[PDB]
């Protein structure tokens, strides 16, 4: 039943006695459910070190992965170019998922097409789909560029993108000069970040490979910036802001910041902003190229060093205090521009915040996960704050990255209780936060189910989730935040210390029990 003036949605509607009664009857009557005592016993077992050993012996099963597949990243890369339509050669189910996944994180339209290869295209190849698809997409959505990647079915059968695209042109399905860069993006290799690297290198190659002869390093006096897979709008924005503040000429290669944040003013804008084709064509004339997320930009780096002949600086992601300092000094060195008083002051304001909050941060223990560059930047900044990373997970990390993070941990007395996991998932991480409980988790929305599991053991075992990363689906507008630079470090620091204080208030809110420590001033 409903009271018309206080209508109940599913929660708390189904807490009503008649629904509870009906659900009890359904369970007991027909579900043949294990008895509750058996369920409790198994749950308790899944929190143990014995279960953890079984859990970490897994060789074949993955449970709750913390990665996605290549073409997701290719699509995001392609969205960063002016009037460019991402186009995924292969099966259309993929594209419905890519668009939805991004819709939910950015709360924005995400435009991408498929050429809808079906069973007979698997068998005969997708050449005809590419021909009709390119002509159709061009006629209908009028992009200036189509950026082609692949789904796994087209990768198994070896559809030759290059050949298929050139035959579409030779047979007049699309104009010969119409830009159609491409990249093979097999989902059974690496992860979504690998797809971003592959797509970018494909686009870079398409615009520069054949015209290197008239290029001269340094002649346009700019620095190229390659952001990598990035889902915080604030991160594109803060890099542009700091470089402009320094008076450094720059070119951000793949810049989806406008198309992922169009105004609601009465019109739908399928495209907005982005890196121009002229910017890509002119990129070899830059002083140098900086890669913001080097641990998934290795193919790009090979191309940029070997073909554009840029001496790509060996720089970590600009996260936290030290690595933002190093980023600015290297940009200063490359461009000849001094670091301006305004950025020096910003730095000092982050340091001020660190001094102001250090007592609540000291010794706090974290589990965390995400992509390799993001995770290592977060680990580095946690150490700067006097926090203890304890469980560091990167499902899509590799052995060289893991050794690099171990070295960062070893360089700080706050890294002594930390372990780095690669190729492990969030079901592994679940065991870890039970057997070696941290104070908080820092991760994406998938972490909410771990928090739920830990609370069921008991309030004193609950590990609250702090949402930083991708995807974030169960809060609104966090994609607008910043994690890079001094600005991102300030946002992260604020989120951490106030997560700590929020939990302490919750734990001290008990009238005449714990509220002796419910201080007004912290």
């Amino acid at each position: 039943s409903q009271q018309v003036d206080k209508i109940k949605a599913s929660y708390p509607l189904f807490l009503d006695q008649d629904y509870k009664d009906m659900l009890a009857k359904k369970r007991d009557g027909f579900e043949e459910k294990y008895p509750q005592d058996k369920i409790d016993e198994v749950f308790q077992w899944t929190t143990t070190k014995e279960y953890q050993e079984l859990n970490f012996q897994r060789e074949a099963l993955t449970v709750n992965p913390a990665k996605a597949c290549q073409p997701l990243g290719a699509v995001l890369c392609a969205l960063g170019f002016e009037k460019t339509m991402p186009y995924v050669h292969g099966s259309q189910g993929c594209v419905a998922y890519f668009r939805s996944y991004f819709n939910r994180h950015f709360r924005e339209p995400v435009s991408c097409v498929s050429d809808s290869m079906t069973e007979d295209a698997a068998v005969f190849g997708g050449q005809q789909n590419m021909k009709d698809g390119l002509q159709n997409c061009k006629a209908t959505y009028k992009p200036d560029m189509i950026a082609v990647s692949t789904t796994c079915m087209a990768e198994v059968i070896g559809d030759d993108l290059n050949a298929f695209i050139n035959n579409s042109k030779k047979e007049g399905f699309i104009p010969d000069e119409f830009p159609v860069p491409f990249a093979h993006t097999p989902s059974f290799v690496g992860s979504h970040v690998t797809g971003w690297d592959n797509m970018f290198e494909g686009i870079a190659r398409y615009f520069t490979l054949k015209s290197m002869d008239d290029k001269v390093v340094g002649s346009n006096k700019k620095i190229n910036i390659v952001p990598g897979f990035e889902t915080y709008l604030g991160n594109f924005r803060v890099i542009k802001r700091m470089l402009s503040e320094m008076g450094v000429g720059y070119s951000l290669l793949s810049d989806p910041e406008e198309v992922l944040d169009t105004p609601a003013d009465g019109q739908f804008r399928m495209y907005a902003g982005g890196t121009t084709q002229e910017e890509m064509k002119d990129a070899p004339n830059a002083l140098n190229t900086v890669l913001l997320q080097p641990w998934h930009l290795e193919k790009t780096k090979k191309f940029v060093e070997g073909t554009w002949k840029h001496e790509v600086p060996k720089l970590n992601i600009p996260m936290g205090l030290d690595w933002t300092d190093e980023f600015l000094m290297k940009v200063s060195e490359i461009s000849g521009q001094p670091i301006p008083a305004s950025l020096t002051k910003e730095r000092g304001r982050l340091v001020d915040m660190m001094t102001d909050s250090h007592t609540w941060l000291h010794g706090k223990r974290f589990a965390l996960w995400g992509d390799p560059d993001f995770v290592m930047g977060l680990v580095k900044f946690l150490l700067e704050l006097g926090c203890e990373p304890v469980h560091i997970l990167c499902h899509n990390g590799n052995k060289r990255w893991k050794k690099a993070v171990d070295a960062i941990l070893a360089a700080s007395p706050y890294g002594k209780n930390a372990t780095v996991y690669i190729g492990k998932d969030l079901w592994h991480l679940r065991s870890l936060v039970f057997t070696d409980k941290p104070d908080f988790m820092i991760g994406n929305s998938y972490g909410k189910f771990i928090q739920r599991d830990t609370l069921h053991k008991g309030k004193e075992f609950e590990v609250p989730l702090i949402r930083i990363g991708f995807p974030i689906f169960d809060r609104h507008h966090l994609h607008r935040s910043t994690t890079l630079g001094y600005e991102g470090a300030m946002q992260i620091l604020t989120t951490l210390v106030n997560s700590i204080l929020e939990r302490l208030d919750e734990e001290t809110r008990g009238m005449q029990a714990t509220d002796y420590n419910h201080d007004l001033v912290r």
Binding site: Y34, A60, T118, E119, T140, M153, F188, G266, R430
Partner: protein, 477 residues
């Protein structure tokens, strides 16, 4: 509005396409005639999508794992193949359930074989066997396993039926291999069919020679309600208040034992015809169990359904039916009194999957609203047959609509409200058109049944009449 004008709009919008696509899309767009009984004379459906036109459709895996099998709560469902498909589909659909997740229920979890390149090249049957051992080790209370194929499994010829049989026997477990590789068929729809057949072949006959279940004459099953935001629960409560016993619901909050008990019921109540008519026909052919379509969207359809269902039984049930209808009458009348004056005359366009585009029309009409365009991603012509009589004359019908078409149609028809999916939502909000998600219920619901109608009405009003929609134009422009 006006038949010649709608036909004019269709031809104008079609002008942008190359000839091949233009010729095809022409067959998938129609101006309704409620008179017409054979929709094949008016619209074509369930055909392959044109390449590069931004279809809204998904794949057979979505139709099998995402829709039919995924909701079954005490089984573990393996997304078999690379990591992508299971991750994008993890907990995206609100098929609600009661359980202890990770212990006796597993719906929100993502199990996968995470195929790597060596698995493609050397095949994944050995990995799948080992994966099944590890599932049994770490999740001992699971009551069965399904193996949901992604694209590569279908190409490379892995023998998942043999693996399911051998491991099934070795562990005395029901293991269900499903060939729902995403390039099969043309949409989610063939996934429904493949999944229904897998239930038929591997699960449904398990209790064929068991007589220990005590059946009654009032035993029914809810077929094809996936309990979105609790939809099936707010339907099941009405059937049971009417004196019927709901032995199973397929597959929202469903359990494998409910599925196995379903051949013992007296009548199959089918809500989603599209996804479950296959197993419904099977059950009538093998078990002799009749089935009937019903509609619990809004009071008019719910009331009509309750009486139709009750007439299938005896006088005692028909008496209880009228008593249920009497109980809820002042509740939905208060909903109408409150919200119908706020919504009267407003015009809605819908685009959804294979059922809701016709099924929710009655509910909109109970609020005095008018559905001026509707269409489906993956319906067949027997769906459009049921749609044309539900829609007004000279309303617009569109099958497998393109992103471009849908936008152009909306610009000319200018609905007050649009009901579609997440990939449509943010496009139309930017055009200043109130939008309701009619797959996820926009994280609201239930919408089925009497209790659901109150929420549906509240939601339509909250969005259509929200103060944000007056604010899109800057005053200085």
């Amino acid at each position: 509005m006006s038949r010649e004008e709608v036909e004019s709009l269709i031809q104008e919008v079609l002008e942008v396409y190359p000839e091949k696509a233009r010729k095809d899309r022409n067959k998938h767009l129609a101006v309704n005639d409620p008179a017409v009984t054979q929709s094949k004379k008016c619209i074509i459906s369930n055909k392959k999508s044109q390449p590069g036109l931004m279809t809204i459709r998904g794949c057979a895996y979505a139709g099998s794992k995402g829709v039919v099998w995924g909701p079954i709560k005490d089984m573990i469902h393996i997304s078999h193949g690379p990591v992508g498909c299971g991750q994008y589909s993890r907990a995206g659909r609100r098929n609600y359930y009661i359980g202890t997740t990770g212990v006796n229920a597993f719906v929100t979890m993502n199990f996968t074989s995470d195929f790597q390149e060596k698995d493609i090249v050397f095949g994944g049957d050995k990995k799948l066997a080992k994966l099944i051992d590890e599932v049994e080790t770490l999740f001992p209370l699971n009551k069965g396993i399904s193996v949901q194929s992604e694209c590569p499994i279908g190409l490379i010829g892995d023998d998942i039926e043999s693996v399911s049989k051998v491991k099934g026997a070795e562990l005395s477990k029901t293991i269900v291999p499903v060939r729902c590789e995403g390039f099969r068929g043309v949409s989610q729809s063939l996934g429904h069919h493949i999944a229904n057949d897998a239930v038929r072949d591997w699960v449904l006959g398990k209790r064929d020679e068991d007589t220990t279940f005590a059946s009654t004459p009032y035993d029914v099953a809810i077929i094809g309600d996936y309990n979105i935001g609790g939809d099936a629960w707010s339907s099941r409560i009405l059937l049971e208040e009417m004196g019927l016993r709901c032995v199973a619901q397929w597959s929202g909050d469903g359990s494998i034992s409910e599925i196995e008990l379903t051949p013992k019921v007296k009548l199959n109540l089918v809500h989603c015809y599209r996804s479950m008519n296959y197993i419904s026909r099977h059950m009538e052919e093998k078990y002799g169990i009749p089935w009937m379509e019903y509609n619990f969207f809004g009071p008019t359809k719910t009331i009509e359904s309750l009486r139709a269902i009750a007439a299938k039984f005896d006088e005692s049930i028909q008496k209880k039916c009228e008593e249920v209808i009497a109980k809820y009458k002042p509740e939905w009348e208060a909903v109408v009194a409150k919200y119908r004056p706020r919504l009267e005359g407003k015009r809605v366009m819908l685009y959804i999957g294979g059922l809701r585009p016709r099924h929710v029309i009655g509910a909109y009409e109970d609020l005095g609203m008018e559905v001026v365009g509707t269409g489906y991603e993956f319906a067949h012509n027997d769906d459009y047959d049921r749609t044309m009589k539900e829609m007004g004359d000279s309303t617009l019908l569109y099958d497998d609509v393109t992103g471009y078409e849908f936008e152009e149609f909306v610009k000319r028809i200018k609905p007050d409200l649009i009901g579609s999916g997440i990939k449509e939502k943010f496009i139309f909000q930017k055009m200043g058109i109130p939008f309701r998600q009619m797959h996820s219920w926009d994280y609201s619901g239930p919408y089925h049944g009497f209790d659901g109608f109150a929420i549906f009405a509240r939601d339509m009003d909250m969005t259509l009449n929200n103060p944000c929609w007056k604010k899109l134009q800057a005053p200085w422009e």
